[PDB]
Every structure is written in C-alpha cells, then in structure tokens.
Amino acid sequence: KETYSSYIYKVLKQTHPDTGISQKSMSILNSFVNDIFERIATEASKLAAYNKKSTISAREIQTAVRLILPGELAKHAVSEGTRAVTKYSSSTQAQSSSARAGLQFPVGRIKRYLKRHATGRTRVGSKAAIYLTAVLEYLTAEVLELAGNAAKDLKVKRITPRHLQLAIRGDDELDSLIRATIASG
Amino acid sequence: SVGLSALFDLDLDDSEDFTVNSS
Known part of the structure; x- marks a missing residue:
C-alpha cells in the first residue's frame, strides 16, 4: 500500500486549477x-503465465486493462497507455521516465511495485510500467474531473x-469498475 | 484508512485541506 497523494494533487491542478481537495478525499483516491493497481498487476502477471511469457510487457497490461475496465473506459485507457509508451520512446532527452512519457504519476515507483506482483523469475518491462502508470493516471483524472465538476x-x-x-456513482462505468474492484478485495 | 467501500454522510467532511509545500 503506497502513497500517491502528491501526484494525484498534480493531476487535480491540471483539470481544476482553483479547486481544492480535502485530506479525507485524498485518502480515498489513494x-x-x-x-486498481493491484487488480491490474494481478491479472497481467497471470496473463503472462498463460501466454507463456517471462516478462510482463505492455501487451499484457493492455489485455488486463481490457478484462478489468468496462466499455469506454477500457478503450480510452488503452489509448492513453499506448500514447505514453510512444511518447516515451519518441522523446529520449528528458531525465525522468515520467517526463519522457508525459505523465504526472511516477513511472519508476510503479515499476518497482509492479515487481512485487511478478512471482517467479518473471520480469517487468519498462514499457509495461509506463503503460500502467498512464492508465492509473487516466482513471484518477477521470474521477477528479467529475468530482471537481460536482x-x-x-x-x-x-x-x-x-x-x-x-x-463515481453517477457514472455507470466508474460505478461498475469500483463495485467490481471492491468485490475483489 | 478510508477505502472505496466508504462511498457505498460523506458530506460531513471536516478534514483539513490537502496541501503541498510551497517551499
């Protein structure tokens, strides 16, 4: 269980610059x-095993995202993960992977966490982490945009x-995703 | 901590603002 508060706050400021957020709200977003991370990391790792891979790559993250995320959320997230990886490879000068990828969430930390879920001799790809980081940022951004709007x-x-x-409850897909995620615990 | 299940008297939030260092 890790802390993403700083990053969540940065995403909030990109979409609702003058809107604040309470500590209690931040605790829930964290x-x-x-x-969500745990659900996707858990599925991706399983997918690597069934497809007989020794590395969790972006392909697996993509498949997991598609199984876990409903409808339109899955496609937009896939679009986001894909775009981040592409940026990441297109622009190599920036010092931080998060920056190369154009993300606020921390790619490096997310790679590290992703490792815990990789069971065996299985490896985690850098691109897998960039893709995952992008997806989490995207979901977080959707919730923030809607909450800020409320x-x-x-x-x-x-x-x-x-x-x-x-x-969340006023959006069919986010509601579905959260209820399912709760059932997962 | 407070998790997602909480969302399922949430307006009674007297917690302080989340803020980051300006310095």
Missing part, C-alpha cells in the same frame, strides 16, 4: 489507485468524499 455545480471550492461519491 485507495483507488492502489486497489463541486462546481454545487458552488463550492473543495472536493469532499461526497463529491467523489457523486462522481
């Missing part, structure tokens, strides 16, 4: 990132867990 609609300045609730 749980969101961790829980706060604005209610004429308030800060995102609370109630706004997170309205955003």
Whole structure:
C-alpha cells in the first residue's frame, strides 16, 4: 500500500486549477489507485503465465486493462497507455521516465511495485510500467474531473468524499469498475 | 484508512485541506 497523494494533487491542478481537495478525499483516491493497481498487476502477471511469457510487457497490461475496465473506459485507457509508451520512446532527452512519457504519476515507483506482483523469475518491462502508470493516471483524472465538476455545480471550492461519491456513482462505468474492484478485495 | 467501500454522510467532511509545500 503506497502513497500517491502528491501526484494525484498534480493531476487535480491540471483539470481544476482553483479547486481544492480535502485530506479525507485524498485518502480515498489513494485507495483507488492502489486497489486498481493491484487488480491490474494481478491479472497481467497471470496473463503472462498463460501466454507463456517471462516478462510482463505492455501487451499484457493492455489485455488486463481490457478484462478489468468496462466499455469506454477500457478503450480510452488503452489509448492513453499506448500514447505514453510512444511518447516515451519518441522523446529520449528528458531525465525522468515520467517526463519522457508525459505523465504526472511516477513511472519508476510503479515499476518497482509492479515487481512485487511478478512471482517467479518473471520480469517487468519498462514499457509495461509506463503503460500502467498512464492508465492509473487516466482513471484518477477521470474521477477528479467529475468530482471537481460536482463541486462546481454545487458552488463550492473543495472536493469532499461526497463529491467523489457523486462522481463515481453517477457514472455507470466508474460505478461498475469500483463495485467490481471492491468485490475483489 | 478510508477505502472505496466508504462511498457505498460523506458530506460531513471536516478534514483539513490537502496541501503541498510551497517551499
């Protein structure tokens, strides 16, 4: 269980610059990132084993994302992961992998965490981590955009867990994803 | 901690703002 608060905050500022977020809301988003990560890492690793691979590559992350994410979320996320990997390889001057990939979330840490889920002699590809990092950032961004929107609609300045609730429960796919994810624990 | 199940009186949030160092 890790901390993504700083990064989550950076994503919030890209989409709702003048909207704040409470510590209680941040705690829940941190749980969101961790829980989703675990579900995707767990599936990807299994997928590598069944396809007889010794490395969890972006192909597997993609397959997992498609099994775990509903409908439109899966396709947009796939678009995001793919785009990040492409950027990452296209632009090599930047010092940070997150920066090369155009991400706010931490690619390096996500690679490290991804390792714990790789059981055997199985390896984690750099691209697998970039793809995963992009997906988590994207999901987090969707929740934040919707929660920020709910706060604005209610004429308030800060995102609370109630706004997170309205955003998630009011969106069929996110609701489905979260309920399924909860069932997973 | 507070997890996703919480979302299923959430407006009673008196927690302080999340902030990062300006320095």
